[PDB]
Amino acid sequence: ATPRLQYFHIAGPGTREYLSEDLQQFISATGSYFDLKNKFRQTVVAPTRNVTTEKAQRLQIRFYPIQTDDTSTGYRVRYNINVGDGWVLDMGSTYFDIKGILDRGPSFKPYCGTAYNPLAPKESMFNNWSETAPGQNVSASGQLSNVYTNTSTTKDTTAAQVTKISGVFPNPNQGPGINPLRQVENANTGVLGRFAKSQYNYAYGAYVKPVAADGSQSLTQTPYWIMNNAGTEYLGAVAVEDYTNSLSYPDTMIVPPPEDYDDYNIGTTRALRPNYIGFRDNFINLLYHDSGVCSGTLNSERSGMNVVVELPDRNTELSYQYMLADMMSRHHYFALWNQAVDQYDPEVRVFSNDGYEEGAPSYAFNPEAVGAGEGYGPDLSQIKLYTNNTAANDKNTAVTNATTNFYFGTVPSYEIDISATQRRNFIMANIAEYLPDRYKFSISGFDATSVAPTTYEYMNKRVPLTNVVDMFTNVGARWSIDQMDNVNPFNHHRNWGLKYRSQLLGNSRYVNFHIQVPQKFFAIKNLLLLSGSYTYEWVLRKDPNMILQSSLGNDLRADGASIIYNEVNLMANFMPMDHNTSNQLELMLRNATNDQTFVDYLGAKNALYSVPAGSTALTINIPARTWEGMRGWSFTRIKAAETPQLGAQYDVNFKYSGSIAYSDGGFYLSHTFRNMSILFDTSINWPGNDRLLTPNMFEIKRSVALDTEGFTMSQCDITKDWYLIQMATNYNFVYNGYRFWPDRQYFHYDFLRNFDPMTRQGPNFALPGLFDLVSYTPTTDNSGEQPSQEAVRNNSGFIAPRSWPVWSAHQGESWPANWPYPLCGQQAIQPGQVLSYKKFLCDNYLWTIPFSSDFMYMGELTDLGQNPMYTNNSHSMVINFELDPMDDPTYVYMLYGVFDTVRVNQPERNVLAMAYFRTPFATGNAV
Amino acid sequence: WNQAVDQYDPEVRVFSNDGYEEGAPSYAFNPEAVGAGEGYGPDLSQIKLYTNNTAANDKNTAVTNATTNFYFGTVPSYEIDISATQRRNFIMANIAEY
Amino acid sequence: YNFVYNGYRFWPDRQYFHYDFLRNFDPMTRQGPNFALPGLFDLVSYTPTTDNSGEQPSQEAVRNNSGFIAPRSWPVWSAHQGESWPANWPYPLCGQQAI
Amino acid sequence: DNVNPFNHHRNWGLKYRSQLLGNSRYVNFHIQVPQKFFAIKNLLLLSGS
Amino acid sequence: DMGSTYFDIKGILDRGPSFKPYCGTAYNPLAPKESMFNNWSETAPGQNV
Amino acid sequence: VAVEDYTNSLSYPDTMIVPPPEDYDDYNIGTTRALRPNYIGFRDNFINL
Amino acid sequence: LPDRYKFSISGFDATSVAPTTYEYMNKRVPLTNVVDMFTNVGARWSIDQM
Numbered sequence A: 001a002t003p004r005l006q007y008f009h010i011a012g013p014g015t016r017e018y019l020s021e022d023l024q025q026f027i028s029a030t031g032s033y034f035d036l037k038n039k040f041r042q043t044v045v046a047p048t049r050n051v052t053t054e055k056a057q058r059l060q061i062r063f064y065p066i067q068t069d070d071t072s073t074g075y076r077v078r079y080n081i082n083v084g085d086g087w088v089l090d091m092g093s094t095y096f097d098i099k100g101i102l103d104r105g106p107s108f109k110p111y112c113g114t115a116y117n118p119l120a121p122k123e124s125m126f127n128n129w130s131e132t133a134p135g136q137n138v139s140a141s142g143q144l145s146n147v148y149t150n151t152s153t154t155k156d157t158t159a160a161q162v163t164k165i166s167g168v169f170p171n172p173n174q175g176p177g178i179n180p181l182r183q184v185e186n187a188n189t190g191v192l193g194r195f196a197k198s199q200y201n202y203a204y205g206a207y208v209k210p211v212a213a214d215g216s217q218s219l220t221q222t223p224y225w226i227m228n229n230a231g232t233e234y235l236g237a238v239a240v241e242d243y244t245n246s247l248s249y250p251d252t253m254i255v256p257p258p259e260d261y262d263d264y265n266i267g268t269t270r271a272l273r274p275n276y277i278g279f280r281d282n283f284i285n286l287l288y289h290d291s292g293v294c295s296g297t298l299n300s301e302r303s304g305m306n307v308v309v310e311l312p313d314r315n316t317e318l319s320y321q322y323m324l325a326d327m328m329s330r331h332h333y334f335a336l337w338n339q340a341v342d343q344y345d346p347e348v349r350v351f352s353n354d355g356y357e358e359g360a361p362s363y364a365f366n367p368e369a370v371g372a373g374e375g376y377g378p379d380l381s382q383i384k385l386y387t388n389n390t391a392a393n394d395k396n397t398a399v400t401n402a403t404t405n406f407y408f409g410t411v412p413s414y415e416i417d418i419s420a421t422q423r424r425n426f427i428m429a430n431i432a433e434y435l436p437d438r439y440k441f442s443i444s445g446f447d448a449t450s451v452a453p454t455t456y457e458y459m460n461k462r463v464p465l466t467n468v469v470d471m472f473t474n475v476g477a478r479w480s481i482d483q484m485d486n487v488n489p490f491n492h493h494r495n496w497g498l499k500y501r502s503q504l505l506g507n508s509r510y511v512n513f514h515i516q517v518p519q520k521f522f523a524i525k526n527l528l529l530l531s532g533s534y535t536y537e538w539v540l541r542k543d544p545n546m547i548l549q550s551s552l553g554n555d556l557r558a559d560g561a562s563i564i565y566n567e568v569n570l571m572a573n574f575m576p577m578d579h580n581t582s583n584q585l586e587l588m589l590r591n592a593t594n595d596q597t598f599v600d601y602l603g604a605k606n607a608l609y610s611v612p613a614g615s616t617a618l619t620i621n622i623p624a625r626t627w628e629g630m631r632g633w634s635f636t637r638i639k640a641a642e643t644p645q646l647g648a649q650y651d652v653n654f655k656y657s658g659s660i661a662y663s664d665g666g667f668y669l670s671h672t673f674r675n676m677s678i679l680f681d682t683s684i685n686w687p688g689n690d691r692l693l694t695p696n697m698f699e700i701k702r703s704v705a706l707d708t709e710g711f712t713m714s715q716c717d718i719t720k721d722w723y724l725i726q727m728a729t730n731y732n733f734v735y736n737g738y739r740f741w742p743d744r745q746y747f748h749y750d751f752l753r754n755f756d757p758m759t760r761q762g763p764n765f766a767l768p769g770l771f772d773l774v775s776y777t778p779t780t781d782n783s784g785e786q787p788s789q790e791a792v793r794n795n796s797g798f799i800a801p802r803s804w805p806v807w808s809a810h811q812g813e814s815w816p817a818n819w820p821y822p823l824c825g826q827q828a829i830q831p832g833q834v835l836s837y838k839k840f841l842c843d844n845y846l847w848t849i850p851f852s853s854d855f856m857y858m859g860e861l862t863d864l865g866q867n868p869m870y871t872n873n874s875h876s877m878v879i880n881f882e883l884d885p886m887d888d889p890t891y892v893y894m895l896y897g898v899f900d901t902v903r904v905n906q907p908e909r910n911v912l913a914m915a916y917f918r919t920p921f922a923t924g925n926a927v
Numbered sequence B: 001w002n003q004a005v006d007q008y009d010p011e012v013r014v015f016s017n018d019g020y021e022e023g024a025p026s027y028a029f030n031p032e033a034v035g036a037g038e039g040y041g042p043d044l045s046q047i048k049l050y051t052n053n054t055a056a057n058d059k060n061t062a063v064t065n066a067t068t069n070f071y072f073g074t075v076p077s078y079e080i081d082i083s084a085t086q087r088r089n090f091i092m093a094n095i096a097e098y
Numbered sequence C: 001y002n003f004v005y006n007g008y009r010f011w012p013d014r015q016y017f018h019y020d021f022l023r024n025f026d027p028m029t030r031q032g033p034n035f036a037l038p039g040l041f042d043l044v045s046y047t048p049t050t051d052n053s054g055e056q057p058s059q060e061a062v063r064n065n066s067g068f069i070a071p072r073s074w075p076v077w078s079a080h081q082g083e084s085w086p087a088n089w090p091y092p093l094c095g096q097q098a099i
Numbered sequence D: 001d002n003v004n005p006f007n008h009h010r011n012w013g014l015k016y017r018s019q020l021l022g023n024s025r026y027v028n029f030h031i032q033v034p035q036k037f038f039a040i041k042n043l044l045l046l047s048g049s
Numbered sequence E: 001d002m003g004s005t006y007f008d009i010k011g012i013l014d015r016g017p018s019f020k021p022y023c024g025t026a027y028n029p030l031a032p033k034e035s036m037f038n039n040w041s042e043t044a045p046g047q048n049v
Numbered sequence F: 001v002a003v004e005d006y007t008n009s010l011s012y013p014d015t016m017i018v019p020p021p022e023d024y025d026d027y028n029i030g031t032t033r034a035l036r037p038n039y040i041g042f043r044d045n046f047i048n049l
Numbered sequence G: 001l002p003d004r005y006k007f008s009i010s011g012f013d014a015t016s017v018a019p020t021t022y023e024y025m026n027k028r029v030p031l032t033n034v035v036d037m038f039t040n041v042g043a044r045w046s047i048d049q050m
Helices: A003-007 A021-029 A156-163 A316-327 A418-430 A456-460 A496-503 A579-590 A720-731 A742-747 B082-096 D012-019 G022-026
Strands: A060-063 A074-078 A081-083 A095-103 A138-140 A194-197 A222-227 A234-242 A252-255 A268-271 A297-300 A363-365 A386-389 A394-398 A413-415 A440-442 A462-464 A514-518 A532-541 A562-573 A597-599 A606-611 A617-621 A632-639 A675-679 A755-758 A839-842 A848-850 A878-882 A890-895 A901-905 A913-917 B027-029 B048-053 B058-062 B066-068 B077-079 F016-018 F031-033 G006-008 G028-030
Touching (some): A074 A562, A156 A234, A316 A742, A606 A617, B048 B066, G022 G028
Parallel strands (some): A138 B066
Antiparallel strands (some): A060 A562, A095 A562, A222 A234, A297 A532, A363 A413, A386 A394, A606 A890, A755 A839, B027 B077, B048 B058, G006 G028
16 A cells, blocks of 8 residues: 555555546546546455465365276276365366376278378379289389480490389389470480389378388389380380288278179279267266266265265266356367367258359369360371461471471360369268268178178278269258258267367377366365365276267277276365465355255256157156156157166167267257157146147147148248247247347257258159159168169269269269259249258257246246145156157157255264255156 | 348458469379370380399390380379369359359 | 366356467377387488478488379479379378378 | 349358248248337237237 | 547558569469460571471 | 560569479479468558557 | 478579578478378377477
8 A cells, every 4th residue: 555556546545436526427427428437547456465375385286096996897086185174175176187098999080081192093003013923924004204314225324223223213202304295205215113013003092111211112122124025125114012011001991893893993992981089078978977876976084974976867967068058158169178069060961052163164284285185186296387478478488497396276174163073072971971871882892790880891881872962962952961860960070079079189099198077966066175084986987989989979899999097186276265264264164054055057857768760659657746846848869879878887788989969968859859748647738728729739840741720930840839939948038029049049059049940842753754763772782883873864974873882983974964853943843843841950959848837937946846736736747759750769868857956064074964855856766 | 030131242242362372283183093195205005024134234034924004204184273263263153243 | 267276167258358368278189100119210301401402302201192293302383293102101190000 | 342242142141041942943931921010010919809 | 538549641652572462373373383385486587496 | 376575575473483403404394383472561450650 | 381491492592692581481492291281190280390
């Protein structure tokens, strides 16, 4: 409070108490148009007393396990958090510092495409050399680039280069080195090259590990002479290296032609499917949460009873996902808690087929501007240039030696439309490659039942059908491919969150990971422990499918993935606040009238109801209950293959490593709910007041083709009833008018941000014309040939055959396309020959129904949750579903509305007691 | 409410002519790596391969039958500047068209 | 962000600042081959010859995109030349044939 | 500069609006059009006919 | 309020020859990097050409 | 044939010649590349003005 | 890339012009192997030379 500081308002009183009172009224009055409040400084002074100890105190304490007890399924660690008096510990700052060794398995490509000769054409060959015995029957094809301007008819100019052949001198990188190739003479140039003796001659992805520090892929180089039909004339030399055993094709696969074409055709080489095997969002599935058989244990010393009890019907991971997404936007990337949300490519899921950016005719010209590619026109290779006679208007003088090139026509070029070429490459690799297995076929060397359908090389060696999706697939419609509307979009190499999460571990599969995992159990997520000695043990998963997330969802255990935890230490930060006040703080927190209370953010009992493949309906009957504070219902359906056994130490039937929609918020099956009904008693419908347009059921969607009375809103098949339910729940205003609500777009799990209605038209088949020339059923035979796909004849001569795998070389001839019936234009099909396909996708939403009498949010403890007709009187509801029938077993992830709270009471030193209470479902059993 | 505001492309209205992304000379090669497009240099179509003699530094033995093509020079290719191509197609189909 | 003892968390309230911590703090990780081993010859050279000539023959040891780009000793923006060849430099850090 | 920039195929709003109806020129459209007149845009009508 | 006071500066700026406002070139940009614009090399008109 | 003398009337603005090495200086002209894109605008907030 | 990872183009020579000049930066092509497609092919990794 020095007067020198006070004069400049650095440690002075403050603006409100030193300015003239009239001035404060003036600046406030004229504060909306003439702001003067920034011209009078004010400084906020720190407490500077009774807030921090001078005692030598550790600011950040590392806790290392007393006991470990490693096992094959989990990795337990037992800590002992000693909090002295005057110390106050927040478990919000507690986390597990985990460092170990991570093997992400060979099924891990951190990059699309290949790294070896990426610019090489797929069906290229690296200077072939195929022989039976050295010097015996030999076949060889390659470019001979290097020149040495030899004087021929003798060995001296050639043998000099041959003596250099044995080294790296052939040097495949260097070529002719002459820019005008026209200037070189055929008899005074010399020929050099370097050929490879190997099996599987493919330039694309060809890798031969070096043996010396200067290129030198091989140590033995037998030289061969090049001579014309006569042996007298010396023409060139050849270097040959044996790559039969030294050659490999990492991150690439051979796509052979069909079995009838296996001979006299080597097919093409394609890079393996990119796969990212990084950790999951927020380190989900890394601690044994939600498991009552292998839970953690936090308890004090005086009170030996464990205060961390976990139920198999709660969801710790998903609750954190919802809590964090409401706390902040999910597009923020926080690498500490590995906070990278699972996000697909919006251009890939809802495939807005807008054709392609049709531009001017674009060509690829010669390296020079002179040539005769497809040399139509007169030869002009033997012409003679004569000087003109301006008086006689004719030739007068012949030029002595006119060395002229002088070809005919424009620059020889090959035409490409990149905007269409890249469009099909985008469609057929970011969309086609992720089709379901039922729309794929083997590659003429692969056989089913040899490996499980959840392995990496199974997914690589099954090319999708080329007509189920292509450039013509609903050419003008923003339409998510209905063939993959039920395919997990987060299992995609464009999943930027997982893409970031995998690259935080490195580009190799041998990762010495060091990570920090937050505590997520709601009772101890933000617990503020007072003085005392606490022991807090927790067990960590070792399942590669659980702890690691693939971008393909393959079985990581079957792909050799594994993890070893070396050190798992517990970090805690302690405020160095004055012991005279922290004991006061801990004493006003030991007082029972003011003790910590924590709720699970999800607030939902979690029940998974099996729905088999062919089934389309599900009945959820429940025993008699009081529903004393129920919040409502939330439900989506999750594939059983993507959902682990609940409360399982180690799930053996779980052979999937993509995005577990149960654990995280990666919901993608909010569609495929036709309708649902609620009956609290055997026959008492919950709405039961003619609230809805269909009072006895929650008709989520109805087909617009069969629609007669309407009941479809937002230009899709969702119903008026269901649309009102969602907007009323999330946004609290439907009776004042439907509107968009930008205040909740950040939430990443609300309705409007991801409710995507789409519409296409499609030709009406089963008509005299309109033959539906696209086959969706593969022949599921060993050969990589699908003749049923050869009826589309689009891009006929410019793409690979439709029966062939897509990534094979093009062949055919230009031919009028026949398949895509023009739905628009002046040559369009008849208006009676078209249909409508109103549809909607809604990802990451998890449909909610509030247990509120007007469906509008009016408090966490809803309108009817305290209505003493349910609270006082027992009821046993039955919930009836009908769903779009899928082809694989799925659950129906039904989330009720529960008030799962904890009252943490710490009456004495190191006496810790937690009381758990859940209002509708207090017993927490299997329902 | 069919709420989708009319959005002109800002890169189209105010044409910020930043040229094009000039990289290395881009080349489109033959489907194979072997070809004789613009067949400059010696033909090498009727050649015969001879085994070497290390001691004599010369030809010693002819190969029985060498089915080889052995074209001259680098891999035949056509040069295309993708970035300039896209820039012009963008201009003509987005600015010149309208 | 004035809160560390209650737990490390992302703070979206300061991501506009253009000079705060979490906006521009970018951790990254790579693995790389371990050279100074019997194999793994480190076929990339980082020291140019520093001569008047426009040739760097020490760069000719990567043999990747052999017949499809300019020679590695040549300036990058020269015409492509060479012959197709299996690449040797980039040691596979992943996949079946990973080191 | 004096040509309507919203009459462009890169009109993302218009592209979305046209794609909401389908890929054909033959549309069995079903839409919900709001009321915009200010007197009755937000009028709270009491009981009555 | 000197918050509104600024300097209305106008003058002649020469940014120098070291100024390319655009990546790439503007003259035959689609031309291949090593092409020739229809060569004609001679010693004298009608001589060695 | 039409021949025009551009010996002194021709220039290569915004482009530079990237010649091959001296071992390839003859019998090869290499390629040409545009100069590095350089923007010489003023600084942010007219800093250092 | 830094000047220490570049070289002259067989026509340009150092010490002829200041290193802080434009045509010095133009006429110094960088080394092609220090940064290329294969440079940490799977890693989100800022180039340690940059």
